[PDB]
């Protein structure tokens, strides 16, 4: 038989790719015109997929970049058991694997990272990972830090002893109202059927929570150009992250913008913080790129 997406649709209809276990992946491309001045791969947070950044694709693509992504494995279109992985770091080798075949067909272009959330971690190890490949990261919101409400260190203790004991046992989900103030984003987030919103497995808490000792530990190696946004009032990625990695960063070329009173997702927030959002995109990519 072919294989599937996991809503039933054959990857041979779809642009995807095969990863190092041998699981396909779905792909999106926004491909300018002309000859692109670069490559920008976009790298989608926990439980969500590439579809929810068309409005920013297609702005990025206004700019003559050539934007990609995928679905990670165990979200949307790809394949996987839903938001499990086996170890945090196939998500980073998969992104490498993507960046590498895209490269390939594109030599000497600039490439940039994109990334939200869970996708924001990601994005910083892959840069890292990489020391003086990226030409630039974009942060919306990046997983930066353990949660203070979820994770405190007695928290993180009861999870790894969870995680011997019942891997497998589901946590329950987020309040959707915690990701935006715009109250029509989060009635579309409720309502996308490739939204994973049935809860975390201890198992992925922990995978998550290995994320930000990795990010941690890479951050006085991180040398890479970066935009950073931020809300204020974030309950999931609590804005300290973000004044930590302004601070341990060793980038010569940083940047954080933040958001006051916005909630986690700022390129889905109130008009007033989704426009600026996409114009500080705009402005900081269209200057490090010709």
């Given at each position: 038989?072919?294989?599937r997406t996991?809503?039933?649709?054959?990857?041979?209809?779809?642009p995807?790719?095969?990863?190092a276990?041998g699981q396909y992946?779905?792909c999106?491309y926004?491909?300018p015109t002309?000859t692109?001045?670069?490559?920008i791969?976009?790298?989608?947070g926990?439980?969500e997929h590439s579809?929810?950044?068309?409005?920013?694709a297609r702005?990025?693509m206004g700019?003559?970049?050539?934007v990609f992504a995928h679905?990670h494995?165990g979200?949307?279109?790809?394949?996987?058991?839903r938001?499990?992985?086996s170890?945090?770091?196939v998500f980073?080798?998969?992104?490498?694997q993507?960046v590498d075949?895209?490269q390939?067909?594109y030599?000497?272009?600039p490439v940039?990272?994109?990334?939200h959330?869970?996708?924001?971690?990601?994005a910083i190890?892959?840069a890292?990972?990489?020391?003086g490949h990226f030409?630039g990261?974009?942060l919306?919101?990046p997983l930066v830090?353990?949660?203070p409400?979820?994770a405190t260190?007695?928290?993180v203790?009861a999870?790894?002893?969870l995680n011997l004991?019942?891997?497998?046992?589901?946590?329950?989900?987020?309040?959707s109202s915690?990701?935006?103030?715009?109250?029509?984003?989060v009635?579309?987030?409720?309502s996308?059927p490739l939204?994973?919103?049935?809860?975390?497995?201890?198992?992925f808490?922990?995978?998550?929570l290995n994320a930000?000792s990795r990010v941690?530990?890479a951050?006085?190696?991180?040398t890479?150009?970066?935009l950073?946004?931020?809300g204020?009032?974030?309950?999931l990625?609590?804005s300290?992250g973000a004044?930590?990695?302004?601070?341990?960063?060793?980038?010569?070329?940083?940047?954080?913008?933040?958001?006051?009173?916005?909630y986690?997702?700022?390129?889905?927030?109130?008009p007033?913080?989704?426009?600026?959002?996409?114009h500080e995109?705009?402005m900081?990519?269209?200057?490090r790129?010709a």
């Open positions: 038989s072919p294989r996991p809503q039933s649709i054959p990857y041979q209809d779809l995807h790719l095969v990863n276990d992946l779905f999106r926004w491909k002309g692109p001045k670069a490559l791969f976009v790298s989608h926990a439980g579809g929810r950044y068309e409005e920013l702005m990025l700019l003559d970049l050539l679905d494995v979200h949307g279109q790809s394949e996987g058991e938001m499990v992985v170890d945090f770091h980073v080798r998969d992104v490498l993507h075949s895209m390939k067909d030599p000497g272009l940039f990272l994109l990334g959330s869970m996708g924001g971690a990601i190890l892959t890292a990972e990489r020391p030409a990261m974009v919306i919101s830090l353990a949660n409400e979820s260190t007695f928290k203790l999870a790894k002893v004991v019942l891997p497998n046992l589901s946590l329950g989900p987020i309040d915690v990701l935006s103030r715009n109250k029509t984003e009635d579309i987030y409720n996308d939204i994973c919103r049935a809860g975390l497995k201890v198992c808490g922990i995978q998550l930000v941690e530990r951050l006085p190696k991180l890479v150009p970066f950073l946004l931020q204020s009032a974030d309950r990625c609590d300290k004044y930590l990695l302004m601070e341990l960063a060793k980038s010569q070329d940083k940047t954080l913008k933040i958001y006051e009173g916005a986690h997702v700022l390129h889905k927030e109130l007033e913080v989704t426009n600026s959002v996409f995109i705009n900081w990519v269209s200057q790129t």
